[PDB]
Amino acid sequence: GREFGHLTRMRHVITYSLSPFEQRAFPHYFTKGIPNVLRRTRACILRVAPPFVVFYLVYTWGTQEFEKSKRKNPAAYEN
Amino acid sequence: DNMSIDDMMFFLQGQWMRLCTSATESEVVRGKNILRNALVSHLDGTTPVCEDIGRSLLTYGRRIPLAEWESRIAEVDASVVREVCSKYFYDQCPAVAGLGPIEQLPDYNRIRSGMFWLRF
Amino acid sequence: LSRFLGPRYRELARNWIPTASMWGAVGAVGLVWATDWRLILDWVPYINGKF
Amino acid sequence: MLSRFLGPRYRELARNWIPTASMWGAVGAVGLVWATDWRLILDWVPYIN
Amino acid sequence: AAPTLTARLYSLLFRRTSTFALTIAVGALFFERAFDQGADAIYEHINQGKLWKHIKHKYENK
Amino acid sequence: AVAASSKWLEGIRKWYYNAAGFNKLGLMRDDTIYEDDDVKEAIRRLPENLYNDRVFRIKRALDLTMRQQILPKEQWTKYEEDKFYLEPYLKEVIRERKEREEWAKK
Amino acid sequence: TNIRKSHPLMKIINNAFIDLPAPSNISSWWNFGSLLGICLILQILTGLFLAMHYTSDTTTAFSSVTHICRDVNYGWVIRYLHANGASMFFICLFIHVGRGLYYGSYMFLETWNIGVVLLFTVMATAFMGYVLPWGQMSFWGATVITNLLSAIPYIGTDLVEWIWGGFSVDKATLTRFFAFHFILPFIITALAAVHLLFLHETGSNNPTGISSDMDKIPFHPYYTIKDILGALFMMLILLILVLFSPDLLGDPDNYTPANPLNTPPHIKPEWYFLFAYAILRSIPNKLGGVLALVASILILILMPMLHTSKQRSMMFRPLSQCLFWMLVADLITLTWIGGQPVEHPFIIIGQLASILYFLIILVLMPITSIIENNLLKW
Numbered sequence: 001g002r003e004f005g006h007l008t009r010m011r012h013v014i015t016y017s018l019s020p021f022e023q024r025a026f027p028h029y030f031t032k033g034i035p036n037v038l039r040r041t042r043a044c045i046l047r048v049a050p051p052f053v054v055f056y057l058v059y060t061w062g063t064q065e066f067e068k069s070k071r072k073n074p075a076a077y078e079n
Numbered sequence: 080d081n082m083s084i085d086d087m088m089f090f091l092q093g094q095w096m097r098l099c100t101s102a103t104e105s106e107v108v109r110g111k112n113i114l115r116n117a118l119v120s121h122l123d124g125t126t127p128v129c130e131d132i133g134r135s136l137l138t139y140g141r142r143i144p145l146a147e148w149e150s151r152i153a154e155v156d157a158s159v160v161r162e163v164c165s166k167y168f169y170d171q172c173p174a175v176a177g178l179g180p181i182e183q184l185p186d187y188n189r190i191r192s193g194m195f196w197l198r199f
Numbered sequence: 200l201s202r203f204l205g206p207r208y209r210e211l212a213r214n215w216i217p218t219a220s221m222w223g224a225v226g227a228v229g230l231v232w233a234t235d236w237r238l239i240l241d242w243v244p245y246i247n248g249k250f
Numbered sequence: 251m252l253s254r255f256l257g258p259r260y261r262e263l264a265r266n267w268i269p270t271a272s273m274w275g276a277v278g279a280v281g282l283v284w285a286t287d288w289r290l291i292l293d294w295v296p297y298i299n
Numbered sequence: 300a301a302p303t304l305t306a307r308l309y310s311l312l313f314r315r316t317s318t319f320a321l322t323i324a325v326g327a328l329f330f331e332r333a334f335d336q337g338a339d340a341i342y343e344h345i346n347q348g349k350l351w352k353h354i355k356h357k358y359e360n361k
Numbered sequence: 362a363v364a365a366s367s368k369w370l371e372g373i374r375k376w377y378y379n380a381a382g383f384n385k386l387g388l389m390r391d392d393t394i395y396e397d398d399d400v401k402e403a404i405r406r407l408p409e410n411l412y413n414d415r416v417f418r419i420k421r422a423l424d425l426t427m428r429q430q431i432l433p434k435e436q437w438t439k440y441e442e443d444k445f446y447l448e449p450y451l452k453e454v455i456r457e458r459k460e461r462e463e464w465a466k467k
Numbered sequence: 468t469n470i471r472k473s474h475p476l477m478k479i480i481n482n483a484f485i486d487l488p489a490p491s492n493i494s495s496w497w498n499f500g501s502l503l504g505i506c507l508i509l510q511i512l513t514g515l516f517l518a519m520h521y522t523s524d525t526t527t528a529f530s531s532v533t534h535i536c537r538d539v540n541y542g543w544v545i546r547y548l549h550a551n552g553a554s555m556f557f558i559c560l561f562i563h564v565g566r567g568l569y570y571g572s573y574m575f576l577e578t579w580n581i582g583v584v585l586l587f588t589v590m591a592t593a594f595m596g597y598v599l600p601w602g603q604m605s606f607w608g609a610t611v612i613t614n615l616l617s618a619i620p621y622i623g624t625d626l627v628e629w630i631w632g633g634f635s636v637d638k639a640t641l642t643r644f645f646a647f648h649f650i651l652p653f654i655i656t657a658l659a660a661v662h663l664l665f666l667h668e669t670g671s672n673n674p675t676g677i678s679s680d681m682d683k684i685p686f687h688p689y690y691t692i693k694d695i696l697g698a699l700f701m702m703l704i705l706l707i708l709v710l711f712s713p714d715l716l717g718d719p720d721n722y723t724p725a726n727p728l729n730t731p732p733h734i735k736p737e738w739y740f741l742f743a744y745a746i747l748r749s750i751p752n753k754l755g756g757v758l759a760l761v762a763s764i765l766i767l768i769l770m771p772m773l774h775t776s777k778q779r780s781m782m783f784r785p786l787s788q789c790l791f792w793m794l795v796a797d798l799i800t801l802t803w804i805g806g807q808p809v810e811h812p813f814i815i816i817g818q819l820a821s822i823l824y825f826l827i828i829l830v831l832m833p834i835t836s837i838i839e840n841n842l843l844k845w
């Protein structure tokens with residue numbers, strides 16, 4: 001089939017691993033990731049935020065506006 | 080061959096576990112006899128034994144006499160075999176090396192997975 | 200069917216008995232833990248879920 | 251993109267295979283007339299009832 | 300250095316899978332009762348007085 | 362008809378070159394293109410010296426994204442440096458596909 | 468000799484769930500489809516335990532639901548789990564569609580289409596099961612939504628008469644929906660198996676989008692524990708949303724017994740349909756509202772033909788990704804507009820939201836894909 005035994009050509013690329021037991025699970029797991037998280041963040045907040053903020057603004061836009069077409073009516077309907 | 084890479088492995092680790100649990104004494108004496116033959120076969124000739132003198136001294140010291148070696152082969156029992164094999168084969172981290180192409184060969188954990196039978 | 204019989208097989212079962220017998224004990228006590236079986240829980244000083 | 255189909259050999263295939271298209275389409279039309287009890291075309295044929 | 304109590308504890312129950320399952324079973328049996336009753340007495344303790352089990356006294360044994 | 366303004370085009374294509382993240386992983390532009398079967402056969406056309414380079418770079422990036430950590434700041438590709446090796450291959454694939462189609466239409 | 472390769476069934480599982488080659492660089496988004504696979508069986512057993520009491524009669528059903536919520540031993544948990552759990556199903560399902568669209572796993576055409584048919588199937592099962600509990604929203608909702616097909620110049624009004632089994636909602640129509648509702652999920656299972664069967668023999672997609680055939684990696688050592696962790700955390704989401712937010716997920720009003728007589732103030736359709744229902748507000752002529760309604764789901768099929776940008780994905784292209792987020796935002800729009808009681812500003816916003824909802828993909832995406840191609844010799 002497409003199983004590992006016969007696939008793409010690949011050559012003199014080499015692997016260096018470690019036995020899981022010989023190494024601890026959390027190698028500087030804190031300090032390394034935070035700048036990464038924050039950089040990914042500053043990377044994509046630019047491309048994620050504006051639809052959602054525009055949505056929130058239209059949300060309160062229509063809610064508050066129509067609400068002003070709603071609660072305020074008796075003066076709008078005059079005496 | 081590329082398509083059977085895992086397969087030899089698939090059996091090989093079992094052999095180690097085979098040595099762990101259920102190591103028949105008949106197999107033990109088989110291995111001992113082949114071992115004794117390996118010694119006597121090594122010790123034919125002048126150069127090999129000059130080397131034996133030339134290395135045994137660096138090792139234990141001594142020429143370590145064959146009467147001792149064969150007393151020490153008679154020394155072995157299947158219980159002791161299963162114990163030592165347990166102390167090295169049964170759950171211990173492999174150090175594996177390959178030059179192929181390798182691709183069928185299982186990744187380390189999977190390889191590591193075989194060092195211990197789930198049944199034991 | 201007679202094949203099961205054999206000099207190694209006697210020794211072999213002798214060898215495998217601890218591992219599989221252990222499972223039965225583990226399987227039995229665990230099954231008691233799963234059905235929360237009564238009368239043995241009478242015999243445990245600690246785990247009396249009963250008042 | 252879609253220009254590849256736009257060829258004299260393919261328009262040829264159109265001219266060759268069109269009557270057959272009318273054939274099978276008429277067949278399924280009649281099947282609609284029958285199985286669905288499509289009385290509107292059952293009404294077109296006097297023999298019914 | 301000298302092996303940790305945890306270290307020899309490996310050579311004990313962990314390395315053998317049957318005993319491993321066993322300690323999983325006894326461990327479940329203890330974690331059950333202890334955590335269960337812990338959640339008991341604590342839940343009893345937090346929002347105290349909302350409980351009627353302590354308010355059973357208005358109507359029990361006369 | 363564009364000519365005098367072309368500078369600024371390049372002045373945003375580079376931004377567009379920045380706009381894509383592949384430079385941050387440093388991969389060749391040719392690597393990015395999807396492998397439909399014909400372009401795959403164009404991949405087949407490649408010399409091994411060029412082939413394994415591609416394969417290795419790809420595996421590097423594939424390891425990175427698994428860690429999510431980006432390729433190091435120093436190594437990031439320049440807009441000039443990224444050889445577009447596949448051009449003869451793919452352009453001939455186009456020429457040949459459109460060839461056999463060009464005969465197929467008559 | 469080899470055990471997994473011994474038995475042919477085991478050969479199949481080993482070609483798949485035991486050790487199918489997989490890309491390594493996979494993130495949680497791919498964990499989500501597996502999460503769908505998680506939810507499905509859970510709803511099935513949960514609905515089984517529910518099917519041990521519920522009745523499909525017009526009269527006796529609701530009393531049996533009350534038999535569930537109050538009589539049954541911890542069955543209330545089951546009740547809410549089937550409900551809220553279905554809600555979770557749609558949760559993950561939506562993310563999943565978003566993924567396949569985003570990383571371009573729709574490039575696997577047949578797999579994709581089976582996903583589509585599977586989607587319509589899930590929608591129907593949703594609707595009918597929602598009709599089942601038997602309450603005010605159940606009644607009037609099912610009635611109103613069923614009425615839509617009457618927009619057909621001939622057949623559809625006839626067809627509603629055929630579903631109902633009578634003049635109106637009744638033990639006829641209700642038992643009808645109970646049975647369709649029951650038969651479909653099992654169909655969904657087989658479509659799932661078929662779906663994966665298309666997936667295996669093309670290989671899985673990767674986050675990069677670009678092929679990772681060179682980096683294919685064993686499934687069992689790695690992704691199994693990954694997806695186990697993912698399912699356990701969804702189990703957190705669900706259990707926290709059920710033991711701490713038992714009711715909020717749905718629409719109270721069903722809690723009132725249905726009356727063909729008594730008529731509910733607002734009849735908001737349950738939330739996953741809200742965007743769809745919003746589109747019912749979109750245009751004059753109920754017929755075209757039905758057309759656009761079906762088109763809202765149908766339109767997905769165009770995309771693989773509409774796709775032309777060189778990515779098989781959408782992560783190295785923030786450009787088109789921006790159009791993407793405009794489209795997702797647009798879905799949020801149709802959602803919240805569908806949630807509100809009908810009003811004129813909501814009407815115009817829903818109009819332009821709908822036009823743009825079609826046009827981002829019928830206009831913006833392909834052509835911007837073309838200019839994006841022009842920028843770098845694509």
Ligand SMILES: CCCCCCCCCCCCCCCCC[C@@H](O)O[C@H](CO[C@H](O)CCCCCCCCCCCCCCC)COP(=O)(O)OCC[N+](C)(C)C
Pocket residue numbers: 170195196197199233313314315316319320323504505506508509692695698699702
């Ligand atoms: C679908 C809808 C949602 C489902 C909701 C359920 C969510 C479940 C999620 C819970 C997570 C379960 C985690 C599984 C734990 C183990 C996973 C696996 O990776 O561990 C293996 C290990 O397996 C475990 O060690 C075996 C433990 C045996 C305990 C069996 C439990 C018995 C339960 C029986 C059911 C009783 C109830 C019956 C009612 C009818 C790998 O072994 P290894 O990492 O290499 O270490 C052991 C190596 N040795 C042998 C050398 C020591």
Ligand code: HEM
Pocket residue numbers: 497498499500501502503504507563564567572573575578579580581582583585586659662663666671672673
């Ligand atoms: C609950 C029913 C479904 C199941 C079991 C199913 C299989 C799920 C799962 C398990 C994956 C594979 C990726 C993974 O989870 O690791 C994905 C296969 C796929 N499904 Fe479905 N699917 C289901 C409903 C849908 C729907 C409605 C669509 C939208 C059209 C869809 C589009 C895909 C795609 C594109 C893949 C290929 C995986 C990939 O390339 O990443 N699926 N989904």
Ligand code: HEM
Pocket residue numbers: 507510511512513514515516517518521532546549550553554556589592593594596597599600601649652653
């Ligand atoms: C994923 C597909 C399914 C969906 C969308 C679905 C609808 C779910 C949901 C939404 C509930 C409704 C609970 C409520 O609204 O209060 C339940 C309706 C129902 N489903 Fe299904 N169902 C699905 C598969 C099944 C299966 C497989 C069974 C039986 C084994 C089943 C038995 C029920 C019952 C009895 C109800 C009505 C429960 C009530 O009155 O609250 N469902 N399920």
